[PDB]
Write an enzyme that holds these catalytic residues in place. Structure first.
Site, short mmCIF file in Angstrom:
data_model
loop_
_atom_site.label_atom_id
_atom_site.label_comp_id
_atom_site.label_asym_id
_atom_site.label_seq_id
_atom_site.Cartn_x
_atom_site.Cartn_y
_atom_site.Cartn_z
N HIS A 1 0.79 -1.24 0.00
CA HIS A 1 0.00 0.00 0.00
C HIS A 1 0.82 1.29 0.00
O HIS A 1 0.33 2.35 -0.41
CB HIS A 1 -0.97 0.00 1.18
N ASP B 1 3.81 9.38 -0.26
CA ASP B 1 2.55 8.69 0.05
C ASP B 1 2.24 7.63 -1.02
O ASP B 1 2.39 7.87 -2.23
CB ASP B 1 1.40 9.71 0.12
O1 LIG Z 1 -3.11 1.77 11.38
P1 LIG Z 1 -2.63 3.17 11.44
O2 LIG Z 1 -3.74 4.20 12.07
O3 LIG Z 1 -1.34 3.31 12.39
O4 LIG Z 1 -2.29 3.71 9.97
C1 LIG Z 1 -3.32 3.69 8.96
C2 LIG Z 1 -2.85 2.98 7.69
C3 LIG Z 1 -1.81 3.88 7.00
C4 LIG Z 1 -1.24 3.25 5.71
N1 LIG Z 1 -2.12 3.63 4.57
C5 LIG Z 1 -1.67 3.37 3.19
C6 LIG Z 1 -2.94 2.99 2.41
C7 LIG Z 1 -3.43 3.69 1.32
C8 LIG Z 1 -4.71 3.20 0.66
O5 LIG Z 1 -4.36 2.27 -0.36
C9 LIG Z 1 -2.67 4.87 0.70
O6 LIG Z 1 -3.59 5.84 0.14
C10 LIG Z 1 -1.80 5.55 1.75
O7 LIG Z 1 -0.94 6.46 1.07
C11 LIG Z 1 -0.92 4.58 2.54
O8 LIG Z 1 -0.23 5.35 3.54
C12 LIG Z 1 -0.94 1.72 5.84
O9 LIG Z 1 -0.73 1.14 4.54
C13 LIG Z 1 -1.96 0.89 6.65
O10 LIG Z 1 -1.45 -0.42 6.88
C14 LIG Z 1 -2.24 1.59 7.99
O11 LIG Z 1 -3.11 0.84 8.86
O1 LIG Z 2 -9.88 12.06 11.38
C1 LIG Z 2 -9.84 11.34 10.38
C2 LIG Z 2 -8.76 11.41 9.50
C3 LIG Z 2 -8.77 10.66 8.33
N1 LIG Z 2 -9.75 9.72 8.13
C4 LIG Z 2 -9.75 8.83 6.95
O2 LIG Z 2 -8.56 8.06 6.92
C5 LIG Z 2 -8.22 7.73 5.59
C6 LIG Z 2 -6.74 8.02 5.34
O3 LIG Z 2 -6.32 7.41 4.14
P1 LIG Z 2 -5.17 8.05 3.22
O4 LIG Z 2 -4.80 7.12 2.12
O5 LIG Z 2 -5.51 9.38 2.67
O6 LIG Z 2 -3.92 8.19 4.24
P2 LIG Z 2 -3.31 7.01 5.17
O7 LIG Z 2 -3.76 7.18 6.58
O8 LIG Z 2 -3.74 5.65 4.73
O9 LIG Z 2 -1.83 7.15 5.08
C7 LIG Z 2 -9.10 8.60 4.68
O10 LIG Z 2 -10.00 7.79 3.98
C8 LIG Z 2 -9.84 9.55 5.61
O11 LIG Z 2 -11.17 9.74 5.19
C9 LIG Z 2 -10.82 9.63 9.02
O12 LIG Z 2 -11.73 8.84 8.81
N2 LIG Z 2 -10.87 10.44 10.14
#
Ligand SMILES: O=P(O)(O)OC[C@H]1C[C@H](N[C@H]2C=C(CO)[C@@H](O)[C@H](O)[C@H]2O)[C@H](O)[C@@H](O)[C@@H]1O
Ligand SMILES: O=c1ccn([C@@H]2O[C@H](COP(=O)(O)OP(=O)(O)O)[C@@H](O)[C@H]2O)c(=O)[nH]1
Ligand SMILES: O=P(O)(O)OC[C@H]1C[C@H](N[C@H]2C=C(CO)[C@@H](O)[C@H](O)[C@H]2O)[C@H](O)[C@@H](O)[C@@H]1O
Ligand SMILES: O=c1ccn([C@@H]2O[C@H](COP(=O)(O)OP(=O)(O)O)[C@@H](O)[C@H]2O)c(=O)[nH]1
Lengths: 440, 454
Positions: free
Chosen positions: A143, A345
């Site tokens: 991801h 990202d």
């Molecule tokens: O579990 P968290 O709250 O510490 O972090 C949220 C997620 C962030 C990360 N999100 C990714 C997913 C996506 C959705 O495919 C991308 O848009 C983001 O750029 C990328 O950072 C990670 O891959 C997940 O395993 C994590 O659970």
């Molecule tokens: O206070 C918050 C902040 C973010 N999000 C959600 O968390 C996801 C973050 O996904 P993203 O790929 O943009 O970033 P990531 O956390 O996976 O790196 C998005 O769908 C947001 O709608 C949420 O539900 N509540």
């Protein structure tokens, strides 16, 4: 046959795509409970689907999750070598639970099952399973970004990781550059045979690579955005610039505050007439690099407001809190500008959700970082380099004054792309490609 | 006949701080010559800058960049200020800053000398000039010389930690008269002096030490209350008038002071956070505005406290803010005094809770500015000099954040009758101890002393 999904945490969002595939068939969603302390494997069933969770010991969580996943892989994969905290007992921990999870998932598999593994926590999983005799079709999806060799080869344990990743039949990436970087790394270590496009051999092992850019559910976001406040009746004067993301150093929040300061500094015409709201709930708050960024933002909010604020106008609203998804979609809708400028990202769904939530007859403008994976598709956004704060300022001023004609045309091109490549289109493409693979 | 006033900081003929405001009003009653620093640096050597505006003549000098560093930034602001405000941990004593302090006191004494007539009475103001009388006596001026200390005088356990404490005491005894804000300040001075040498005291207030004779007395500084009411009753600038009819649902808590560690700004923020946490009924219904212009920004201690304050604003708004409601407005900016008075008038609560303060004019300005028919509530720290007088304020100990929050909740819900009662009593005190009265008592006590003769 049955679909087996393995990920760090399960949901008894990424959820809709995974739940979607696994509904078109059914099977298992196996993953860690998200809790700790010691027990037999817990199951919950609902038709064709079952959920399977398990706990972890405190020491195992620390080494595998807090340390190797979050303090080694996360920083390194986001091009933050200065932040990696490699120690051997953590690398051993990361191998030990990956193995443990192969043990626990053994008495649940069936010989024709397909297996879908998700994310940086589970890189050595295909290796653990194949060692225990499994020959089923195994797919991996990463991801987050995959870093170029010069960054990747710095991991003391990089060569093992590369060997083990080759135990997957299919490896899926967010973008083309991620795919190439992985192939680049492998090529540095060993000879790779590209029989034909996107099909490879190294150390004798066979595997395929492909780009699956993850998407959202456009209709659903539209629904909740249009749903049913007093603040809105009060702010027909102020244009709203809005940001939301986890409080993470990959997101470039301090550089964002500095670009906003630059807007306020060089475009005084906006004083009193604009607002910037940043939502940033705490994430992984027990790692030092995260606490660092968190204190920085507190200080920067206090500083910028103290300098540019007025008795009846606070320029910057920083909220260190989690907000519910449906509410955020509504906020996207009334926001004149969407500010999404991460330093690195994998995709960033926030940028896609912002465009999806817009009223198509009166849409806000998306300002987007060139380093977000989404920049590859959303070519009609205002594309910016977050290391040039004045360029981000210039783009924000551009977005605030953009005529409705240009707003509509940029927004439609972007909504077009997001519609074509849905979350459902994403998950179907992966599962299909995984099925065509001949097992050994 | 003629009054010669000397202070570091002057009010410019045509900056936050209570000394310049106090003296300005003092001289509008008197008339006089005001000798002091222009505020500029460079061309230290240019002649004295003389400006006449009614019965006040100004004469100002510049300081050199280096004179500014040693006398002002190092010794006054990094040794005297922290020590006198009970912050020994913040003192940065080194001998060269001390030598610097005495050098510029002497330089200034040379500059004043030719402007002095034989029957001049001389009034020196504040800690920058403790050695001044001593420099003057050394140059043979036998005139009446009074001193007024605007800040607290610390107890012996604190004062005696100053490496240079004995010289300071010796030089203070070269004044004919020493005025203090409070009896506790006057008593602390006399206590410190008693440890060093035998002092003979007649009555309570008349003294000899090392054969030098001098008098001590308490003169709590005041404001010009009718003038404050008039500037407060004026209309708001058109921009802010429009804004005012939006703060009709929200109650306003207001504070204003230099961003100084003596003012307990971090602790005050912690008190407000406690209000938010333990009294959730106020969510969306109140606002606290803190105006805090940067003061003495080149001293490390002042940079530190500013960074603490900034962090706390970001943190508290980050934790308790909502999409359409920001609990705390922090403004690191100077506001015109006349505007401030109008802001005081429409506020429901004035939060004035310093850790140590010589007096605190803001607390008195706040009560004078109120509409007597709809007055707000003063919440006041027991450590401000003004708490000796403003007995009907809500008096609190800012070390107990919960007690400050309780007082805030009480001030926010206080009935009209109780508000008027409280306001009238405090306003009565403020009217009886006018800035005119302050000037009058001090000058009259000084005119009662016979000059030393050769
Ligand atoms: O579990 P968290 O709250 O510490 O972090 C949220 C997620 C962030 C990360 N999100 C990714 C997913 C996506 C959705 O495919 C991308 O848009 C983001 O750029 C990328 O950072 C990670 O891959 C997940 O395993 C994590 O659970
Ligand atoms: O206070 C918050 C902040 C973010 N999000 C959600 O968390 C996801 C973050 O996904 P993203 O790929 O943009 O970033 P990531 O956390 O996976 O790196 C998005 O769908 C947001 O709608 C949420 O539900 N509540
Ligand atoms: O001249 P600065 O900018 O270095 O500081 C502003 C003033 C703060 C200080 N004001 C004091 C005066 C007064 C009233 O004269 C008291 O109300 C305050 O509690 C006390 O802090 C200091 O004593 C003055 O010499 C300074 O000019
Ligand atoms: O932005 C500001 C801040 C403060 N003040 C004034 O500065 C003085 C502060 O004096 P005080 O005795 O309260 O404290 P000090 O600064 O001398 O320690 C008061 O007259 C205030 O009205 C002002 O005019 N504008």
């Amino acid at each position: 046959s049955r679909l087996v999904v393995v990920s760090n945490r399960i949901a008894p969002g990424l959820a809709v795509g995974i739940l979607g595939a696994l509904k078109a068939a059914g099977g298992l969603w196996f993953g860690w409970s998200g809790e700790t302390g010691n027990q037999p494997l817990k199951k919950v069933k609902k038709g064709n689907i079952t959920w399977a969770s398990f706990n972890l010991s405190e020491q195992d969580l620390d080494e595998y999750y807090n340390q190797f996943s979050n303090a080694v892989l996360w920083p390194a994969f986001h091009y933050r070598l200065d932040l990696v905290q490699f120690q051997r007992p953590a690398w051993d921990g990361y191998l030990r639970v990956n193995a443990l999870l192969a043990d626990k998932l053994l008495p649940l598999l069936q010989d024709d099952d397909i297996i879908w593994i998700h994310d940086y926590h589970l890189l050595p999983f295909a290796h653990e399973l194949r060692k225990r005799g499994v020959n089923n079709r195994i797919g991996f999806f990463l991801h987050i970004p995959f870093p170029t060799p010069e960054i990747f080869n710095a991991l003391p344990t990089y060569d093992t990781l590369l060997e083990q990743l080759c135990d997957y039949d299919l490896l899926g990436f967010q973008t083309e550059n991620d795919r190439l970087a992985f192939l680049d790394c492998l090529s540095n270590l060993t000879r790779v045979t590209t029989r034909s496009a996107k099909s490879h051999t190294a150390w004798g092992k066979a595997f395929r690579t492909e780009v699956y850019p993850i998407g959202i559910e456009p209709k659903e976001i539209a629904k909740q955005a249009a749903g049913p406040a007093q603040l809105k009746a009060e702010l027909k004067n102020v244009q709203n610039i809005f940001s939301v993301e986890r409080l993470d150093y990959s997101k470039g929040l301090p550089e964002r505050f500095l670009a906003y300061e630059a807007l306020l500094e060089k475009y005084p015409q906006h004083h009193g007439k604009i607002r910037y709201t940043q939502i940033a709930p705490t994430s992984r708050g027990d790692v030092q690099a995260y606490q660092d960024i968190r204190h920085q933002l507190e200080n920067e909010a206090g500083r910028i407001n103290g300098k540019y604020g007025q008795l009846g106008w606070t320029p910057l609203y920083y909220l260190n809190q989690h907000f519910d998804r449906k509410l955020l979609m509504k906020i996207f809708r009334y926001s004149d500008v969407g500010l999404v400028t991460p330093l690195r990202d994998g995709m960033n769904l926030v940028a896609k959700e912002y465009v999806a939530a817009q009223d198509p007859a009166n849409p806000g403008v998306l300002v987007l970082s060139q380093f977000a994976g989404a920049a590859n598709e959303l070519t009609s956004a205002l594309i910016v380099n977050p290391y040039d704060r004045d360029e981000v300022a210039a783009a924000l001023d551009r977005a605030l004054t953009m005529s409705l004609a240009e707003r509509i045309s940029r927004h439609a091109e972007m909504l077009d792309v997001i519609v074509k490549n849905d979350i459902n289109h994403w998950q179907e493409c992966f599962i299909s490609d995984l099925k065509q693979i001949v097992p050994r």
